[model samples]
Target: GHMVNSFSGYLKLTDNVYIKNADIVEEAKKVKPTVVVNAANVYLKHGGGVAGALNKATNNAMQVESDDYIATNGPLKVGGSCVLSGHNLAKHCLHVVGPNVNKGEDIQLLKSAYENFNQHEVLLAPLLSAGIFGADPIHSLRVCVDTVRTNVYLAVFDKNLYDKLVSSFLEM
Candidate 1:
């Protein structure tokens, strides 16, 4: 098939970062980023969605460590994060629980989930709380764009989303 699987471009306010219409799992292998973000719930479960894909990609080792982390630390707070080794996937894996829009504190939690704590600067992530967790995609994109401190690659898996992000983000 000649059809391309993804598209990439920069947002208006954040020129240093770019968004791509692609899969984080497949791209993580090709790019070999040291840290890849996974959309997770407070329980730190890795059996569904992006977390599920990462679990399979990393040979189930990532989940085991995350299991250990959560077991030891208890449930992750909304918008909190936990870091684990990525096995063959990457040097490290970051598990972030984005805000469940059904609840309050949307801004801080969503921003907290997107905000960068890495000082070394190789970034790759997806829209936090914008998927199964149910936060507005464009709104999540805005927070992500604003929270960015370094060059990052944000992956969007749909064509409409790619166009919406590009068009709507520029409208900002």
Candidate 2:
């Protein structure tokens, strides 16, 4: 498979929304967004998927940060959000807990997830919960499009996933 890099040929979904076949880890380097979002668990584990790449990008410092955050603040609610140091990734990392399909809640719970990301300036976000949490890719994208109160770079890593989401974004 070809590598997903930047938002070079990204689709302009709207005046504020942009869809791209990009690695969230790489996208930040060029734009230098004020925040890079992490699709995280309630416990703030950065084990795999989007969090995995960012964790490694920061040289595993993110895992240490999350652990210390939990040790101090405890786990977040399903639709909650928190800010963390993304090291060189961005000025800050917005960690939001999406609804895990096999567990706590469903679709609209995902909406609550987006509602909590009240950060300032540019943000690079991924289609959350589509990994181990098992969210429907397009549905999560749709929720993202519908709920993001501010402008965002929605980075979709998989080409097929990117295409379908771009199609859905066009459809809406």
Candidate 3:
């Protein structure tokens, strides 16, 4: 996963791959997969997140915006959604949260999406929250697990499959 200031910024540093903030249903039409897994979240807080931070930290510069990558969680301008980070599963789509990410401002839509999707995947989306947040690993993990279990795709940003991500969680 990596972050590009823009599509142009991404092109300047890479090749012919395209990572677009796609229209989910539309994309689903074009690509046929057994399952559409999402590993993204509408950020409830802030972070000018980057896609490839964790990979970069470990000296792995494999994925970039030019890799036909994709992401979602509502807000695309604030460094795309957390699910879009594709470093681990270079060719799959993600919803939010992954290897790359640092700092930015709050983005509620994405955070809501993360929680909402984990519940039932096709739950009307744009979930409502009570405006309460805690900085606990368990809380985040619960969200992660909930989101991951329901999707045909496994939303992972953990150690077991850091280098082998896929549309399906089979790699894990």
Candidate 4:
């Protein structure tokens, strides 16, 4: 995939790739992505950060469904992932577990989440492990950008971090 500058500050990484500064859930309501990614822990609980917002936006339906999947596949190993559907947030939600930075390879865990998407569709992904999980934001962005080869809507809410992302891409 090739990266191209596009629309305000969004850096398009490919024909389908795009980044935006917006709330993940709110943007999903407008964009209606076919596939949405959740940066989940091993438990697959949609409880905080983007995951929590997704749960509320989808009327907590995602949490209910995710809870079931967790029961069947509880304690999802680091770098492991699973897919859930039938939620209004998106046609599919790819949930991946990223260890708390020290226990496992956080970047690879995030990469596996993006790689899990085989169908080409509008994919809404966040900077996994960049928030409460405590991974380097720029490094997380790099992993996100590198893994997604199809259409992607990267939700970035921080201005300084967004600038750094853009600058890094521009420099390359």
Candidate 5:
């Protein structure tokens, strides 16, 4: 396959399209994607990401006011402080701190997930990014990662989110 990819640059694709792992402007001039795609969703084991979390500064990357960085196909929203954990803009994210784990309550995080599901058209979340109330980052990541896998549309930190983002077309 004659595939083209980029690590950076800029571009504008179309009214409704998906762009992944593209140097938007440069690639758009070459092959031209429907819209710019971000295939940077790489995940690593040990509850860590291969590319590392999005620096908190980029949290508002989506807020860029221009045609190049167009708004999501629809409104993107992120909830909880998880927004602060990852990088760049989220199409639609909701962050909700669940109850402390010692309480043996699943409803807190579950409720948070359900909230985002009901509120947004597309929700992207790294559950552990929301932080654990009483659990260590390791244990919290373990438990939350397991739970979210069963439910929610998680763009896992592993390289999988890149796939999941593209899969959104069919999965949604």
Candidate 6:
């Protein structure tokens, strides 16, 4: 497998796309994804980033339900993912551990996270590395755009990063 070191590039793959600089909770509600994918840590506890937001939104049900899975399947490796489903919203939620910044594995981890799902329909994804992970936004965004094939709603909190993504894709 050829791993890309950076995503400071662009690839416009589809017309059915929604990228917004907004709270992921609001975006998730609007998008109504059959599956929502988030950047999570190995512990499976909702500490911060998208994980915390989602945990709060779900009223801590995600944590309660996912604890057993975490105990069994974890500690999840850096590119691994775990699925939590049958929650109040969305048919499923995938918690994927993102790579550390400058790990040179950001794209691969992000791609692998998306690949865990067999189908993509109304999938909600966050900017994988923009928050706690501190990975390059350009590369992270490109990994997301290139990997997910179906309809996607990307909830981006950082307006500046969102703008950068828009600018890059606009070139295509």
TM-score of each: 0.85, 0.90, 0.28, 0.82, 0.30, 0.79
Candidate with top TM-score is 2
Off by over 4 Å in 4: 1-10, 102-108, 118-120
Question: In candidate 3, how many Å is residue 141 off?
Answer: 1.8
| lDDT rank order | 2, 1, 4, 6, 5, 3
At residue 135, what lDDT does model 2 achieve? Answer: 80
Off by more than 4 A, model 5: 1-88, 102-109, 128-152, 158-172
Residue 96, candidate 1: alpha-carbon lDDT: 83
- Please report how far candidate 1 places residue 140 from its true position, in Å: 0.5
Tell me the deviation in Å of residue 71 in model 6. Answer: 2.0
Error of 6 at 38 (Å): 1.8
Worst 10 residues of 6 by lDDT: 3-12
lDDT of each: 0.75, 0.81, 0.30, 0.72, 0.31, 0.70
Q: Which whole-number lDDT from 0 to 100 does residue 18 have in model 1?
A: 80
**Local accuracy of candidate 2 as per-residue lDDT tens digits, 56-99:** 89999989999999999999998889998968878789998999
The local distance difference test score of model 6 is 0.70
Which of the predicted structures, 4 or 6, would earn the higher TM-score when compared with the native?
4
Q: Write the per-residue lDDT of candidate 5 for residues 1-172, one digit (tens) a residue.
A: 7443222221112221222443222333343222222212111111212112322223334223211222323222222222212223332223333444555645345444334333333223343433333434333333433333222233233345444444543443
Candidate 2, TM-score vs. the true structure?
0.90
RMSD to native for every prediction? 4.9, 4.6, 15.2, 5.0, 13.1, 8.1
Which of the predicted structures, 3 or 6, would earn the higher TM-score when compared with the native? 6
Over the full model, what C-alpha lDDT does candidate 1 score relative to the true structure? 0.75
Judge candidate 2 at residue 95 and give its lDDT: 94
Residue 112 of candidate 5: its Cα lDDT?
47
Q: Write the per-residue lDDT of candidate 3 for residues 1-172, one digit (tens) a residue.
A: 5432111211110121122233323333343332233332233222212223323421443233323343322333432333332333233334433322223344333344454345433211111111122222333333444443343222223333322222222322
Instruction: Write the residue-wise lDDT of candidate 6 on 60-90 in tens digits.
Output: 9988877888777668887778777837656
| Pairs with backbone N, CA or C atoms under 3 Å apart (clashes), candidate 2 | none
